[PDB]
Coordinates of C-alpha atoms and ligand atoms in Angstrom, one line a residue:
Chain A
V194 CA -13.3 18.5 187.1
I195 CA -15.3 20.8 184.7
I196 CA -14.5 21.8 181.1
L197 CA -15.9 24.3 178.6
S198 CA -14.4 26.6 175.9
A199 CA -17.3 29.1 175.4
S200 CA -18.0 32.8 175.7
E201 CA -16.1 34.8 178.4
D202 CA -19.1 36.0 180.4
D203 CA -20.3 32.5 181.3
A204 CA -16.7 31.7 182.3
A205 CA -16.6 34.7 184.6
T206 CA -20.0 33.9 186.1
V207 CA -18.9 30.4 186.9
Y208 CA -15.7 31.8 188.4
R209 CA -17.6 34.3 190.6
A210 CA -19.9 31.5 191.8
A211 CA -17.0 29.2 192.6
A212 CA -15.4 32.2 194.4
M213 CA -18.4 33.2 196.5
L214 CA -18.7 29.5 197.4
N215 CA -16.2 26.7 198.3
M216 CA -15.0 25.3 195.0
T217 CA -11.5 26.7 194.8
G218 CA -9.9 24.4 197.5
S219 CA -7.5 21.5 197.1
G220 CA -9.5 19.1 195.0
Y221 CA -11.6 21.3 192.8
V222 CA -9.3 21.4 189.7
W223 CA -10.3 21.8 186.1
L224 CA -9.1 22.8 182.6
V225 CA -10.0 25.9 180.6
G226 CA -10.0 26.6 176.8
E227 CA -8.4 29.4 174.7
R228 CA -10.1 32.8 174.9
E229 CA -11.9 32.5 178.3
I230 CA -8.5 33.2 179.9
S231 CA -8.1 36.8 178.6
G232 CA -10.2 39.5 180.2
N233 CA -12.8 39.6 183.0
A234 CA -12.5 35.8 183.5
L235 CA -8.8 36.3 184.0
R236 CA -9.5 38.8 186.8
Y237 CA -11.8 36.2 188.4
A238 CA -9.3 33.4 187.7
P239 CA -8.3 31.1 190.6
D240 CA -4.7 30.5 191.7
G241 CA -3.7 27.3 189.8
Chain B
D1 CA 10.3 47.0 171.3
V2 CA 6.8 48.5 171.7
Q3 CA 6.2 52.2 172.6
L4 CA 3.4 54.7 172.7
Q5 CA 3.1 58.1 171.1
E6 CA 0.9 61.0 172.2
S7 CA -0.9 63.6 170.2
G8 CA -3.8 66.0 170.7
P9 CA -5.0 69.6 170.3
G10 CA -3.1 70.9 173.3
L11 CA -5.7 73.7 174.0
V12 CA -9.3 72.7 174.0
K13 CA -12.2 75.2 173.7
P14 CA -15.2 75.4 176.0
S15 CA -18.0 72.9 175.0
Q16 CA -15.6 71.3 172.5
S17 CA -15.0 67.6 172.2
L18 CA -11.5 66.7 173.4
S19 CA -9.9 64.6 170.6
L20 CA -6.8 62.7 171.9
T21 CA -4.8 60.3 169.7
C22 CA -2.3 57.6 170.6
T23 CA -0.1 55.4 168.5
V24 CA 1.3 52.0 169.3
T25 CA 4.7 51.1 167.7
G26 CA 6.1 47.6 167.7
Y27 CA 2.9 45.5 168.1
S28 CA -0.8 45.5 167.1
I29 CA -3.9 47.0 168.7
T30 CA -6.3 44.1 167.9
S31 CA -4.1 41.1 168.8
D32 CA -3.7 41.8 172.5
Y33 CA -3.2 44.5 175.2
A34 CA -5.6 47.1 176.5
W35 CA -5.2 50.9 176.6
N36 CA -6.3 53.2 179.4
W37 CA -6.6 57.0 179.3
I38 CA -5.4 58.7 182.5
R39 CA -5.5 62.3 183.6
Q40 CA -2.7 62.9 186.2
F41 CA -3.0 65.9 188.4
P42 CA -0.1 68.0 189.5
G43 CA -0.6 66.7 193.1
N44 CA 0.5 63.2 192.0
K45 CA -3.0 61.9 191.6
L46 CA -3.7 59.6 188.6
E47 CA -7.3 59.8 187.5
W48 CA -8.2 57.1 185.0
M49 CA -11.2 57.7 182.7
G50 CA -11.6 54.6 180.5
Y51 CA -9.9 51.8 178.7
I52 CA -10.4 50.0 175.4
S53 CA -9.7 46.3 174.9
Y54 CA -8.4 44.5 171.8
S55 CA -11.8 42.9 171.5
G56 CA -13.7 46.2 171.4
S57 CA -14.7 46.7 175.0
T58 CA -15.0 50.2 176.4
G59 CA -14.8 50.2 180.2
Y60 CA -15.0 53.6 181.8
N61 CA -16.2 55.4 184.9
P62 CA -20.0 55.2 185.4
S63 CA -20.0 59.0 185.8
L64 CA -19.0 59.2 182.1
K65 CA -21.6 56.8 180.7
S66 CA -22.7 59.4 178.1
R67 CA -19.8 61.7 177.4
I68 CA -16.8 59.5 176.5
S69 CA -15.8 57.2 173.7
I70 CA -12.7 55.4 172.4
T71 CA -12.3 54.6 168.7
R72 CA -9.4 53.0 166.8
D73 CA -8.0 52.1 163.3
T74 CA -6.0 48.9 162.7
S75 CA -4.8 49.7 159.2
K76 CA -2.6 52.5 160.8
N77 CA -2.3 51.1 164.3
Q78 CA -3.9 54.1 166.0
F79 CA -6.6 54.9 168.5
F80 CA -8.6 58.1 169.3
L81 CA -10.3 59.2 172.5
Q82 CA -13.3 61.5 172.3
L83 CA -14.4 63.4 175.5
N84 CA -17.7 65.2 175.2
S85 CA -19.6 67.6 177.5
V86 CA -16.3 69.0 178.9
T87 CA -16.0 72.0 181.2
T88 CA -13.2 74.5 182.1
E89 CA -11.6 72.2 184.7
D90 CA -9.5 69.8 182.6
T91 CA -5.9 71.1 183.2
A92 CA -4.0 67.8 183.7
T93 CA -1.4 65.4 182.1
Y94 CA -2.7 63.0 179.5
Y95 CA -1.4 59.4 179.5
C96 CA -2.4 56.7 177.0
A97 CA -1.1 53.9 179.1
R98 CA -1.2 50.2 178.3
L99 CA -2.4 47.5 180.6
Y100 CA -2.6 43.9 179.5
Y101 CA -6.3 43.1 178.9
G102 CA -7.6 41.2 181.9
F103 CA -5.8 43.3 184.6
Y104 CA -2.5 41.4 184.1
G105 CA 0.5 43.6 183.3
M106 CA 1.2 47.3 183.5
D107 CA 4.3 47.4 181.3
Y108 CA 4.3 50.4 178.8
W109 CA 2.8 53.7 180.0
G110 CA 4.2 56.3 177.6
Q111 CA 5.2 59.8 178.4
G112 CA 1.9 61.8 178.4
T113 CA 1.7 65.6 178.0
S114 CA 0.4 68.5 180.0
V115 CA -2.7 70.5 178.9
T116 CA -4.7 73.5 180.1
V117 CA -8.1 74.9 179.2
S118 CA -8.5 78.5 178.0
Chain C
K1 CA -1.3 32.1 132.1
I2 CA -1.0 34.6 135.0
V3 CA -2.8 33.7 138.2
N4 CA -3.9 36.6 140.3
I5 CA -4.1 35.5 143.9
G6 CA -6.1 37.7 146.3
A7 CA -5.2 38.1 150.0
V8 CA -7.5 39.8 152.5
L9 CA -5.3 41.8 154.9
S10 CA -5.5 44.6 157.4
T11 CA -2.3 46.7 157.5
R12 CA -0.2 47.6 154.5
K13 CA 2.7 45.7 155.9
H14 CA 0.7 42.6 155.6
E15 CA 0.2 43.4 151.9
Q16 CA 4.0 43.9 151.3
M17 CA 4.9 40.7 153.3
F18 CA 2.3 38.8 151.3
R19 CA 3.6 40.0 148.0
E20 CA 7.2 39.3 148.9
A21 CA 6.1 35.9 150.1
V22 CA 4.6 35.3 146.7
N23 CA 7.8 36.5 145.0
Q24 CA 9.8 34.1 147.2
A25 CA 7.5 31.2 146.5
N26 CA 7.7 31.9 142.7
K27 CA 11.5 31.9 143.0
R28 CA 11.2 28.7 145.1
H29 CA 8.8 26.6 142.9
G30 CA 8.3 26.7 139.1
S31 CA 8.4 30.2 137.5
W32 CA 8.8 29.3 133.8
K33 CA 5.0 29.6 133.1
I34 CA 3.3 29.4 136.5
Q35 CA 3.9 32.9 137.7
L36 CA 1.6 34.3 140.4
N37 CA 0.6 37.9 140.7
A38 CA -0.1 38.8 144.3
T39 CA -3.0 41.1 144.9
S40 CA -4.0 42.5 148.3
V41 CA -7.5 43.6 149.4
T42 CA -8.0 45.6 152.6
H43 CA -10.7 44.9 155.2
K44 CA -14.0 46.7 154.5
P45 CA -16.4 46.4 157.4
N46 CA -19.3 44.9 155.4
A47 CA -19.8 41.5 154.0
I48 CA -21.4 42.8 150.9
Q49 CA -18.5 45.2 150.6
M50 CA -16.3 42.1 150.6
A51 CA -18.5 40.4 148.0
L52 CA -18.2 43.5 145.8
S53 CA -14.5 43.8 146.2
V54 CA -13.8 40.1 145.4
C55 CA -16.2 40.4 142.5
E56 CA -15.1 43.6 140.8
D57 CA -11.4 43.0 140.7
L58 CA -10.6 39.4 141.8
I59 CA -13.1 37.2 139.9
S60 CA -12.0 39.1 136.8
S61 CA -8.5 38.7 137.9
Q62 CA -9.4 34.9 137.7
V63 CA -8.4 34.1 141.3
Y64 CA -7.7 30.5 142.1
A65 CA -7.7 30.7 146.0
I66 CA -8.8 33.6 148.2
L67 CA -7.1 34.4 151.5
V68 CA -9.1 35.3 154.6
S69 CA -8.3 36.6 158.1
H70 CA -10.4 37.0 161.3
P71 CA -12.7 39.9 161.6
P72 CA -11.4 43.0 163.5
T73 CA -14.3 43.1 166.1
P74 CA -15.1 39.7 167.6
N75 CA -18.7 40.5 168.2
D76 CA -19.9 38.7 165.0
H77 CA -17.6 36.5 162.9
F78 CA -19.2 37.1 159.5
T79 CA -16.3 38.6 157.5
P80 CA -15.2 35.2 155.9
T81 CA -18.8 34.3 155.3
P82 CA -19.3 36.1 151.9
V83 CA -15.9 35.1 150.7
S84 CA -16.5 31.4 151.4
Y85 CA -19.9 32.2 149.6
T86 CA -18.2 33.3 146.4
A87 CA -15.5 30.7 146.5
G88 CA -18.0 27.9 147.0
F89 CA -20.6 29.1 144.5
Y90 CA -18.5 27.0 142.0
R91 CA -17.0 25.0 144.9
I92 CA -13.5 26.6 145.1
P93 CA -12.1 26.1 148.5
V94 CA -11.0 28.9 150.8
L95 CA -7.7 29.3 152.6
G96 CA -8.7 30.3 156.1
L97 CA -5.8 31.7 157.9
Chain D
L255 CA -45.8 25.6 141.5
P256 CA -48.6 28.2 141.4
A257 CA -50.3 26.4 144.3
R258 CA -47.0 26.4 146.1
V259 CA -46.5 30.2 145.7
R260 CA -50.1 30.8 146.5
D261 CA -49.8 28.9 149.8
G262 CA -46.5 30.7 150.6
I263 CA -47.9 34.1 150.0
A264 CA -51.0 33.3 152.1
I265 CA -48.7 32.1 154.9
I266 CA -46.7 35.3 154.6
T267 CA -49.9 37.4 154.8
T268 CA -51.1 35.5 157.8
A269 CA -47.7 36.0 159.6
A270 CA -47.8 39.7 158.8
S271 CA -51.3 40.0 160.2
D272 CA -50.2 38.1 163.3
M273 CA -47.3 40.5 163.9
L274 CA -49.5 43.5 163.3
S275 CA -51.8 42.2 166.0
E276 CA -48.8 41.4 168.2
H277 CA -47.1 44.8 168.1
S278 CA -48.9 47.1 165.6
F279 CA -45.7 48.6 164.1
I280 CA -44.1 48.1 160.7
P281 CA -40.4 47.3 161.0
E282 CA -38.7 49.5 158.4
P283 CA -36.1 47.7 156.3
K284 CA -32.4 48.6 156.1
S285 CA -31.4 52.0 154.7
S286 CA -28.7 50.4 152.6
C287 CA -27.0 47.1 151.9
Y288 CA -23.8 48.5 153.6
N289 CA -25.8 49.5 156.7
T290 CA -26.4 46.4 158.7
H291 CA -28.8 46.6 161.5
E292 CA -27.4 45.1 164.8
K293 CA -29.8 46.3 167.5
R294 CA -32.9 46.0 165.2
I295 CA -32.8 42.2 165.2
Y296 CA -35.5 42.1 167.8
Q297 CA -37.7 44.0 165.3
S298 CA -37.6 41.0 162.9
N299 CA -37.2 38.2 165.5
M300 CA -40.8 38.8 166.6
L301 CA -41.7 38.3 163.0
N302 CA -39.9 34.9 163.2
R303 CA -42.0 34.1 166.2
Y304 CA -45.0 33.8 163.9
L305 CA -43.2 32.2 161.0
Chain E
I1 CA -13.7 56.0 197.6
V2 CA -10.4 57.8 198.2
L3 CA -8.0 55.2 199.6
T4 CA -6.1 56.3 202.7
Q5 CA -2.3 55.9 203.1
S6 CA 0.0 56.1 206.1
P7 CA 2.4 57.6 207.0
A8 CA 3.0 60.8 205.0
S9 CA 6.0 62.5 206.6
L10 CA 8.0 59.6 208.0
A11 CA 11.8 59.4 208.3
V12 CA 13.5 56.0 207.6
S13 CA 17.2 55.5 208.2
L14 CA 19.5 52.9 206.5
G15 CA 18.9 49.5 208.1
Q16 CA 15.6 49.8 210.0
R17 CA 12.0 49.1 208.9
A18 CA 10.1 51.2 206.4
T19 CA 6.6 49.9 207.0
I20 CA 4.0 51.8 204.9
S21 CA 0.3 50.8 205.2
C22 CA -2.8 51.8 203.4
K23 CA -6.5 51.2 203.9
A24 CA -9.1 50.8 201.1
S25 CA -12.9 51.0 201.4
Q26 CA -13.7 47.3 201.6
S27 CA -11.9 43.9 201.5
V28 CA -9.7 44.1 198.4
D29 CA -8.1 40.7 199.3
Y30 CA -10.3 37.8 198.2
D31 CA -9.8 34.1 198.0
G32 CA -6.3 34.5 199.6
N33 CA -4.8 36.3 196.7
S34 CA -4.5 40.0 197.2
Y35 CA -5.5 42.6 194.6
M36 CA -3.6 45.7 195.9
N37 CA -0.7 46.5 193.7
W38 CA 2.2 48.7 194.8
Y39 CA 3.7 51.3 192.4
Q40 CA 6.9 53.2 192.9
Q41 CA 7.4 56.3 190.8
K42 CA 10.3 58.7 190.4
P43 CA 9.4 62.3 189.5
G44 CA 10.6 62.7 185.9
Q45 CA 9.6 59.3 184.6
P46 CA 6.2 57.6 184.2
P47 CA 5.0 55.3 187.0
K48 CA 5.7 51.6 187.0
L49 CA 4.3 48.6 188.6
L50 CA 6.8 47.4 191.3
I51 CA 4.8 44.8 193.3
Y52 CA 1.9 42.8 191.8
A53 CA -0.8 40.9 193.7
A54 CA 0.6 42.6 196.9
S55 CA 2.7 39.5 197.7
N56 CA 4.7 38.8 194.5
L57 CA 7.7 40.6 192.9
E58 CA 8.0 40.8 189.1
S59 CA 11.0 39.4 187.3
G60 CA 13.6 42.1 187.2
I61 CA 13.8 43.4 190.8
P62 CA 15.9 41.9 193.6
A63 CA 14.2 40.7 196.8
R64 CA 14.1 44.1 198.6
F65 CA 10.6 45.3 198.4
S66 CA 8.3 42.9 200.2
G67 CA 4.9 43.1 201.9
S68 CA 1.5 41.7 202.3
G69 CA -2.1 42.7 203.3
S70 CA -5.7 41.7 203.6
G71 CA -9.2 43.2 203.8
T72 CA -8.6 47.0 204.0
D73 CA -5.0 47.1 205.4
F74 CA -2.2 46.5 202.9
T75 CA 1.5 46.9 204.0
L76 CA 4.6 47.4 202.0
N77 CA 8.1 47.0 203.6
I78 CA 11.7 47.5 202.4
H79 CA 14.5 45.2 203.5
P80 CA 17.2 46.5 203.3
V81 CA 16.7 50.2 202.9
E82 CA 18.9 51.7 200.1
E83 CA 19.4 55.1 198.5
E84 CA 16.8 54.3 195.8
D85 CA 14.1 53.6 198.4
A86 CA 13.2 57.4 198.4
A87 CA 10.4 57.6 195.8
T88 CA 6.7 58.1 195.5
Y89 CA 4.6 55.1 196.6
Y90 CA 1.0 54.5 195.4
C91 CA -1.0 51.5 196.5
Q92 CA -3.7 50.9 193.9
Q93 CA -6.7 48.6 193.5
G94 CA -8.3 47.6 190.2
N95 CA -11.2 45.3 191.2
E96 CA -14.3 46.7 189.6
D97 CA -15.9 49.9 188.3
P98 CA -14.8 52.4 189.5
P99 CA -11.3 51.3 190.4
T100 CA -10.3 54.3 192.5
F101 CA -6.6 54.9 193.3
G102 CA -4.7 55.6 196.5
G103 CA -3.2 58.8 197.8
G104 CA 0.5 59.7 198.0
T105 CA 3.2 58.8 200.5
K106 CA 6.5 60.7 200.5
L107 CA 9.5 58.7 201.8
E108 CA 12.9 60.3 202.4
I109 CA 16.1 58.5 203.3
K110 CA 18.1 60.0 206.1
Ligands
NAG401 C1 -16.4 27.6 203.2 O1 -15.8 27.0 204.3 C2 -15.5 27.9 205.3 C3 -14.6 27.2 206.3 O2 -15.2 26.1 206.8 C4 -16.8 28.4 205.9 O3 -16.7 29.3 206.9 C5 -17.7 29.0 204.8 O4 -19.0 29.3 205.2 C6 -17.8 28.1 203.6 N1 -18.5 28.7 202.5 C7 -19.6 28.3 201.9 C8 -20.1 29.2 200.8 O5 -20.1 27.2 202.1

């Protein structure tokens, strides 16, 4: 479980890295903050 | 209820900056949502130029990296589109459509308006 | 003694809602001698512009509590900075909204 | 206090000379108080590098 | 890249299948979830998003327009076919700059 409420681009880059790699399966769950969920990091968002 | 209103010159001149204008009624431009500018062709071909986000992000085609801009004013809830370095071939239908910022929801498009160049 | 209370707002509709809110809260609480005059200041895009506006018409209005909202362009959040400056220079608190 | 201000101005002169050796250009100040420089921060940040 | 659609002059009756596929330039589908929306437009009104994520239907439409897709090939199907099925269909991707759009498929109910 990871957690960070920061700028959106860092969000987005983490999401891209977890997407290119195997960290969106059943087991890799985490929470997200307020504004990292609206924009590019919402396009790179996982399902869940 | 939120809706969009079009306005523009209607007949642009050669080597003249196209100045489009779109109004949002029922919500705010800075709070949420994003606004795209689309040039539909008569052959049912939507051609999107660029969009502005509520945080001040202008995402447009890389071919238009020096001859396009989107500005706005929050006191009157309005946003302008400036298209520079234009040519004769611009006859199309303008749409100031609205897509939720983050590629989420395509709810309110508008009506758009046809335009020719002469 | 009149208290002029200054509210930093972006559209006109916020100014009229602010001034009706003040009217309703004057009809709610005490109005015999504590009667507040709502004054509304628009957003200029410069912090020294804000300083100058809160100083040329508010600090001679004798403002007891400024009102501040988030900057239009979230690239640098320095709009409330000068106003907290000018409140705090005698240590008057700000109402961040 | 005169010693303090003398040391401060000497440090300022040393920093200015160090910048001039670093980049050899004079960062022009702002045109107006209402004209905030956003992309010119790097012009002054190098100054900070010697402060 | 100009996205390709198929077919373009089909003829679907009332009751049978109305499969309409389209191919993009690369794999639009990623991490299971598709990114190939389906828009149905009627000439005279602005277009509207009818199917989002290529596998989910928005709140307001009954379960008639279904479909799926992966990689390049994304397919939209209609079950059952009604009178309102005849419209203009555009499959569109919005992944990254430049998000090019699809062509145009004309469907007529017999
Ligand atoms: C993720 O797992 C799949 C299935 O085992 C495998 O093919 C793929 O290479 C893995 N990806 C990474 C980045 O390790």
